[PDB]
Design a protein around this ligand. Structure first.
Ligand SMILES: CCCCCCCCCCCCCCCCCC(=O)OC[C@H](COP(=O)([O-])OCC(O)COP(=O)([O-])OC[C@@H](COC(=O)CCCCCCCCCCCCCCCCC)OC(=O)CCCCCCCCCCCCCCCCC)OC(=O)CCCCCCCCCCCCCCCCC
Ligand SMILES: CCCCCCCCCCCCCCCCCC(=O)OC[C@H](COP(=O)([O-])OCC(O)COP(=O)([O-])OC[C@@H](COC(=O)CCCCCCCCCCCCCCCCC)OC(=O)CCCCCCCCCCCCCCCCC)OC(=O)CCCCCCCCCCCCCCCCC
Ligand SMILES: CCCCCCCCCCCCCCCCCC(=O)OC[C@H](COP(=O)([O-])OCC(O)COP(=O)([O-])OC[C@@H](COC(=O)CCCCCCCCCCCCCCCCC)OC(=O)CCCCCCCCCCCCCCCCC)OC(=O)CCCCCCCCCCCCCCCCC
Ligand SMILES: C=C1[C@@H]2CC[C@H]3[C@]4(C)C[C@H](O[C@H]5O[C@H](CO)[C@@H](OS(=O)(=O)O)[C@H](OS(=O)(=O)O)[C@H]5OC(=O)CC(C)C)CC(C(=O)O)(C(=O)O)[C@H]4CC[C@]3(C2)[C@H]1O
Length: 293
């Protein structure tokens, strides 16, 4: 060996691992979505909206079947491979266009900005292609329907083809913009918090290693909380595609930040935020157990 098809078995493993953690936490990921976008559903009346996580998981199995926890999951397992291909293709290029020729230690802010753009551009590129999967994934999760007769979509494939035959690609991509704003916010917080933090803590390796994990998670959760409102409006807009007239609670991104803060208050933006913290730590934790011989 020295060129034994090495580069791709990682790819397979990397995707197989991704599939496993996503599927493991798919149940809580669905509860977080429901709580997040239920207030804007055609199915969930006001007298069906869940009181929280427990209320939700205690009711879902009975309402739609135990397997419904995995409703919309398929897209989670797919997305990995197509996304990854696109990174091998642009991520590096973006790094050099924006971070090229700048020394992180002698230009902190020019590195902060360049790195945002670097991640912002790449994210926008990948989204551009797999966004639809996130769309379907989110639409299906919100499908609180019971039988295939009280179900908005009979699946991912249908969900895609349906909305399209209803709004072309425009429907399938609602929330795009704000999700791109969100990504930059996520990244600014992720790093912003890791820089201030790297100093407030002992970097001489002296800090067990497991404590190092819990802090990485801590940082992933903080970053995820700061950009959560953006995720919230993003999802709320996805909900609209296909809903021709009447119920249209939102018309545009601004129309969304608007209605919410008004009708739902200053926090509706964080509906599912805690659930999303659990989903994230749970996932990172699954990747831990996964590393078995
Ligand atoms: C993958 C590799 C990883 C392998 C590791 C396996 C991990 C297991 C995870 C699998 C579980 C799973 O599929 O769950 C989803 C499954 C379905 O969820 P769903 O999304 O609501 O259902 C939609 C229909 O399945 C299906 O609905 P449909 O019939 O309407 O859709 C048909 C569908 C098919 O076709 C599409 O619509 C796909 C759109 C096309 C996307 C384009 C993709 C291009 C890829 C190529 C990229 C190129 C780069 C490569 C180089 O959920 C379950 O009920 C599974 C429960 C099992 C959990 C067990 C956990 C133990 C506890
Ligand atoms: C320090 C100082 C600076 C910081 C300042 C602090 C500011 C932070 C505050 C942030 C608060 C945000 C509040 C503002 C707000 O709400 O604005 C609303 C405003 C939307 O208002 P709206 O009308 O009510 O909402 C509905 C949306 O307009 C329309 O609905 P939609 O969002 O659902 O649809 C989105 C989509 C509509 O979809 C389409 O138009 C079709 C998309 C086709 C997809 C199919 C693929 C086609 C192939 C594309 C080629 C890809 C190549 C790979 O439009 C697009 O974005 C077009 C697609 C773009 C693709 C870009 C691909 C880039 C590839 C990378 C190239 C690299 C070049 C280097 C060489 O959001 C914005 O879009 C503005 C963002 C500007 C913020 C800038 C931040 C300041 C700095
Ligand atoms: C720390 C930051 C967390 C803030 C946050 O996102 O709160 C979520 C909250 C929404 O909660 P959620 O994720 O939608 O759903 C959970 C239900 O509240 C409540 O659903 P629940 O009643 O089912 O959960 C109550 C809780 C009850 O906990 C207990 O009874 C004590 C047990 C220890 C729990 C450890 C905490 O049980 C759990 O801890 C759930 C475990 C799952 C068991 C299955 O969002 C806000 O109101 C925003 C606060 C603003 C924070 C801004 C941060 C900027 C930096
Ligand atoms: C408005 C919002 C909220 C805040 C920002 C994003 C993410 C958290 C942002 C995030 O993940 C991004 O952040 C990572 C941390 O800095 C960055 O890694 S890094 O380069 O190694 O630093 C990831 O890049 S990648 O190159 O590895 O692939 C990047 O992924 C993308 O660009 C994924 C595309 C599918 C978009 C990805 C993701 C996740 O972690 O849950 C994912 O979908 O998998 C998004 C969920 C959707 C929201 C939630 C978007 O709705």
């Amino acid at each position: 060996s020295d060129q034994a098809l090495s580069f791709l078995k990682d790819f397979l493993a990397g995707g197989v691992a991704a599939a496993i953690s996503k599927t493991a936490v798919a149940p809580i990921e669905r509860v977080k979505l429901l709580l997040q976008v239920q207030h804007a559903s055609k199915q969930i009346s006001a007298e069906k909206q869940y009181k929280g996580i427990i209320d939700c998981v205690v009711r879902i199995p009975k309402e739609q079947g135990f397997l419904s926890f995995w409703r919309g999951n398929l897209a989670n397992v797919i997305r990995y491979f197509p996304t990854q291909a696109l990174n091998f293709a642009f991520k590096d290029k973006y790094k050099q266009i924006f971070l090229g020729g700048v020394d992180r230690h002698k230009q902190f802010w020019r590195y902060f900005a360049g790195n945002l753009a670097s991640g912002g551009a790449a994210g926008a590129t990948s989204l551009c292609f797999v966004y639809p999967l996130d769309f379907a994934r989110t639409r299906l999760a919100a499908d609180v329907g019971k039988g295939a007769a009280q179900r908005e979509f009979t699946g991912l494939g249908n969900c895609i083809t349906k909305i399209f035959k209803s709004d072309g690609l425009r429907g399938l991509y609602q929330g795009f913009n704000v999700s791109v704003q969100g990504i930059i916010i996520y990244r600014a917080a992720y790093f912003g918090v890791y820089d201030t933090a790297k100093g407030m803590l002992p970097d001489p390796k002296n800090v067990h290693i497991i404590v190092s994990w819990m802090i990485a998670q801590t940082v992933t959760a903080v970053a995820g909380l700061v950009s959560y409102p953006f995720d919230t409006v993003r999802r709320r807009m996805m909900m609209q595609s296909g809903r021709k007239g009447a119920d249209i609670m939102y018309t545009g991104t601004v129309d969304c930040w608007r209605k919410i803060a008004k009708d739902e208050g200053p926090k509706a933006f964080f509906k599912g935020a805690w659930s999303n913290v659990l989903r994230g730590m749970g996932g990172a934790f699954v990747l831990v157990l996964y590393d078995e011989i």
